[PDB]
Design a protein around this ligand. Structure first.
Ligand SMILES: CC(=O)N[C@@H]1[C@@H](O)[C@H](O[C@@H]2O[C@H](CO)[C@H](O)[C@H](O)[C@H]2O)[C@@H](CO)O[C@H]1NC(C)=O
Length: 138
């Protein structure tokens, strides 16, 4: 097991065909999970399952540039459950991050930060027990 928050270095940045796999279990009565793909202080892709935003479960995705959050992209399909093991796979494609949860496609996020090679770390945080975080090329 890994200590949360966990920083996964992405040496030389991300590139198309890189697959990141995250295995963990959601804590009971979780509030949030977050993945933050970083370019220095900037957040290229923030992926943020929220378990109780005004008694709704929602995934919020966004980009933070110069300390400012941009336009949120919201997904109401919510495959995480409190107390239960999950797998998140993030596949870098030429034009977007593609995210699957428990083997099922969830969402795509168009690249707003376009210097992919500068996206050099992934932060994993939130209400989880983290089992594994790794990457491979497909
Ligand atoms: C309903 C709505 O628009 N709520 C937003 C919050 O989502 C937003 O929260 C911040 O969201 C960013 C990602 O976009 C990130 O998850 C931060 O950790 C989180 O604090 C908040 C502040 O940017 O703004 C709310 N908007 C309003 C109108 O208050």
């Amino acid at each position: 097991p890994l200590i949360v928050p966990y920083n996964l270095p992405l040496p030389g940045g991300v590139v198309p065909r890189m697959l990141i796999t995250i295995l963990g279990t959601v804590k009971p009565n979780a509030n949030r999970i977050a993945l933050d793909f970083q370019r220095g202080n900037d957040v290229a892709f923030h992926f943020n399952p929220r378990f109780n935003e005004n008694n709704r479960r929602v995934i919020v995705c966004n980009t933070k540039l110069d300390n400012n959050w941009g336009r949120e992209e919201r997904q109401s399909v919510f495959p995480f459950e409190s107390g239960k093991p999950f797998k998140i796979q993030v596949l870098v494609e030429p034009d977007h991050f593609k995210v699957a949860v428990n083997d099922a496609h969830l969402l795509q996020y168009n690249h707003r930060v376009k210097k992919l090679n500068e996206i050099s770390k992934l932060g994993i945080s939130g209400d989880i027990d983290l089992t594994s975080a790794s990457y491979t090329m497909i």
